[PDB]
Design a protein around this ligand. Sequence first.
Ligand SMILES: NC(=O)c1ccc[n+]([C@@H]2O[C@H](COP(=O)([O-])OP(=O)(O)OC[C@H]3O[C@@H](n4cnc5c(N)ncnc54)[C@H](OP(=O)(O)O)[C@@H]3O)[C@@H](O)[C@H]2O)c1
Ligand code: SF4
Ligand code: SF4
Ligand code: SF4
Lengths: 176, 114, 208, 80, 309, 152
Amino acid sequence: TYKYVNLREPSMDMKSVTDRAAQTLLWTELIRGLGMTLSYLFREPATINYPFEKGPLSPRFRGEHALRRYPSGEERCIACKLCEAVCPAQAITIEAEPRADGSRRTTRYDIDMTKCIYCGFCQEACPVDAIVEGPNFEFSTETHEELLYNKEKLLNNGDKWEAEIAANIQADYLYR
Amino acid sequence: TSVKPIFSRDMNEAKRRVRELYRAWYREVPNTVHLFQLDISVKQGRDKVREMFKKNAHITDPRVVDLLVIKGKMELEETIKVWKQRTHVMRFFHETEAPRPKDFLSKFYVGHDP
Amino acid sequence: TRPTVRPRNDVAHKQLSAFGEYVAEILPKYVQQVQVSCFNELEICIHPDGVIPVLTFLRDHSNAQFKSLADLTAVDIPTRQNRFEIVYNLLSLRFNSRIRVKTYTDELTPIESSVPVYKAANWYEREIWDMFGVFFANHPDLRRILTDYGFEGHPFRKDFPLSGYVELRYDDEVKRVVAEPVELAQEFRKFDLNSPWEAFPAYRQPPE
Amino acid sequence: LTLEGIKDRVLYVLKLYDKIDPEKLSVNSHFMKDLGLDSLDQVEIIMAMEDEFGFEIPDIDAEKLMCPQEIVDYIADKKD
Amino acid sequence: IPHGKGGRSSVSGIVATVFGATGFLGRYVVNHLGRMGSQVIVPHRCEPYDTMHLRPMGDLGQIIFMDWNGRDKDSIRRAVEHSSVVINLVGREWETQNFDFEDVFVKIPQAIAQVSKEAGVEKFIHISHLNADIKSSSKYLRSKAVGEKEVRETFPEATIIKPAEIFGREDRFLNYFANIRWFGGVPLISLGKKTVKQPVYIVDVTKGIINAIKDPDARGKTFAFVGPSRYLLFDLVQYVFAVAHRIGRLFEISPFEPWTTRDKVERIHTTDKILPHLPGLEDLGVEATPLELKAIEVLRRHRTYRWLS
Amino acid sequence: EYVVAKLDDLINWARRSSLWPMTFGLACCAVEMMHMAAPRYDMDRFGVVFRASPRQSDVMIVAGTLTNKMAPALRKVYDQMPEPRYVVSMGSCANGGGYYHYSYSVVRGCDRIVPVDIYVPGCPPTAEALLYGILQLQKKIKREKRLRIWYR
Ligand SMILES: NC(=O)c1ccc[n+]([C@@H]2O[C@H](COP(=O)([O-])OP(=O)(O)OC[C@H]3O[C@@H](n4cnc5c(N)ncnc54)[C@H](OP(=O)(O)O)[C@@H]3O)[C@@H](O)[C@H]2O)c1
Ligand code: SF4
Ligand code: SF4
Ligand code: SF4
């Protein structure tokens, strides 16, 4: 359909034009709002007082990585070379080679933490359900020699909290 | 080959052209060399210009010799003005880059199979 | 078939057969092919001669308005023996339709600017000179947009290896920020996805 | 406005460049069936006789000179 | 073992170490090892933040920092244990209110000529100066020619180096002049006689090392560094006013870091050009650089535009 | 003797408690910088007043992606800043370039161009791991200007 805005004409009669000459010359407008709508300061401030208080999130949040393990640990990753092949940024790097018993596992697993674009494509391709984006924004170290991760940085970083992780998926896994 | 040429017709008006804008370069190297506050021997600036124009020498054809120009005709826009900041210019004269051997036996001790 | 498959509509496909039937009728000096995309859009294959001419007919008329120029672009195909391609794309405000105009070319053969017909091909023609290398003559201005001042390669065509030929890095040995050949920290792995068996019978290339 | 004006100015210039001509200051020098250089180089010589003495050579002139004769002469009939 | 090409993010098989390497010279060497590939372990004394302006020098995981004192015989033994070549630029100007300066050219260059010799470094290197002569001069210039004697005993293979008065970008040599806005230029000592020395440009010296850094076949065999042509005049002090057209300091200021009414005034006029028979440069070359052309750059003052020199 | 090391409980508490950050808007990451100065998580009035001119600053901040043509601009601006300067990159594109890391016209990494100090990792860092990236930089002044004058 339509509408027309800013289409109006002044009335042009001496009952009006005072009302527009009691405005220009006496400032009866322009004190209407910012004489007032500004104050209106008397509302409670809204601030999350940071070092202590913190704000909301959701169980589907994304962040620092992990590699779980079952009960008594198997290093849940089977090195099926997938979370590697859907990765848009191509951070992941994986090198398998048959472990002594003959069950296969990894050797090098490196997520670069600069390239990773935080998809949620590597949480959703792993069929054996290993690699999982943690909900901890712990980060920010002082040397780029660092953020590159090896395998045996990840596991700890994913065994430091599994009380966080293992209780999110069981909220979220019923939807997908 | 039947397609309309760009500016030139055969090789003469063409090779009148390359002679021409040479001078716009040759007459203006140095006004920049004081303008960017870059320091070099002003004769270098007249060696490179003449080092480049002698480079592509084997060109057999119109519409090539007109193509190169349309590039060359441009640059005098940027350089005679300031759209570059010192570091789009000096990149012509490569200061930092370690030399290439280009000889034989100097290769054979450094680098595989070029 | 209905539930998950996009329901078609015929009416739109009858008219854009007609209205495009006869623009091969009244400008046969130029138009060399026309067809109807199964989604109800048109593609007019036009010789490179008419570009300013044909649009100008499409520019005004009472049976075809096509005042709004939306999208100029290009595609570059090797093994087409005339490399590049243009595709103009025009919306006719009264009649609610899209009709695209395809015109081939090469690098060396110039094409003539559309700028007096529409003033919105002013930029879209400056760009293409940077990327693919097509050279538009008689253009009020021709310059360098989207690219730095150093790229002598005209990237988006199919010969530019993705990472360009010179990485950049700053060194304090003097002042400047200078340019040293490209040295990566990872190969850019090349995966290989193209699976056999030819799942599409309808598009089956000629038997040969 | 003297033929000692335009023969004095010309003949020293051609010596002054650091390149080929070694005192061929004889006024005939015919350039590359004569002494020889690259065509682009001959196109360098033209300019410094203009910033000096004042002049242009806008045109196909510089292609025909080929000798400090003609240049002197084409200057001769030009100024006076 | 060297791989690939020398651009950056390459190997080229040499480790290194560079002691000092904060002030004028050392910063300007490592910058030539943050290019051709290396492992440059640069330690440093007291300075946490003054070393940052360096870090975009090696690519990534190349240069690596430690902390050390240097009168502790361990601090030099913890790093070098893995190394190939190790050069040494250490030492400075004026006697410190803490370091008594006597053996800091004697004990320090030996303190790092401790287990380095033992632990299996090789191609160890040290610095000398063109003008240091064990005859009596000069209170600072002396104790430097002791290292040529005293220290050379250890590590029979050195290729210890002997360059001239150098002029860099941020250097303090030719910059003591033109800072001399003052009651007037007074040459040393109000005489135009023996100026000047061999003013080689800082690139060539810092391109000498890395040319000897795997030379090969220069070890034990010391070299000295030619200047340009030729000796020079008094005009050098006029040349300053010809074109010029007339780390870890403090928060507010430094109490004393002076012009030193001491060796400083007499160290600059000591001249003594010395033995030619040292190989010493083109052999290690190929480099020599002039003055007249390279002295505009480092000199820019309140006109900042006009030159016409 | 001991007065110096007690003096640096003043000057090393002054420079950390008032910062005048420049910012660079370039790319997506700029908006999750704004919301640091919007009232929810309130950047200013926690000691750090927001943008000023290039000359008056201390901590510049790099957001966004750094192409070729922007490098000649940055390195110049980083200079003019006064002494007590730092560089805190943020976002997954100042760390090695997000993606685009393989492109032709993106500088790879923005450590290459300047001596960067603190990092933060992800398309937009969540407007949180920003401030916890600064409460790193207000804790990254434990340094002392003592023990340069006063040891060597
Ligand atoms: N070959 C020549 O032409 C020439 C000319 C002049 C002087 N020199 C002498 O040859 C070497 C060149 O030095 P330079 O050009 O780089 O100037 P420099 O300013 O003396 O550089 C020396 C660096 O090492 C530091 N340093 C001073 N004493 C130290 C010590 N005992 N232990 C560890 N570090 C110490 C200095 O301060 P920090 O301790 O804070 O790091 C400085 O960072 C020096 O020994 C110099 O005295 C040579
Ligand atoms: S997690 Fe899934 S994807 Fe990542 S490695 Fe183990 S199996 Fe392959
Ligand atoms: S996190 Fe996002 S980017 Fe990093 S790997 Fe998994 S998907 Fe690829
Ligand atoms: S990564 Fe940070 S910077 Fe690169 S695009 Fe996503 S947000 Fe903008």
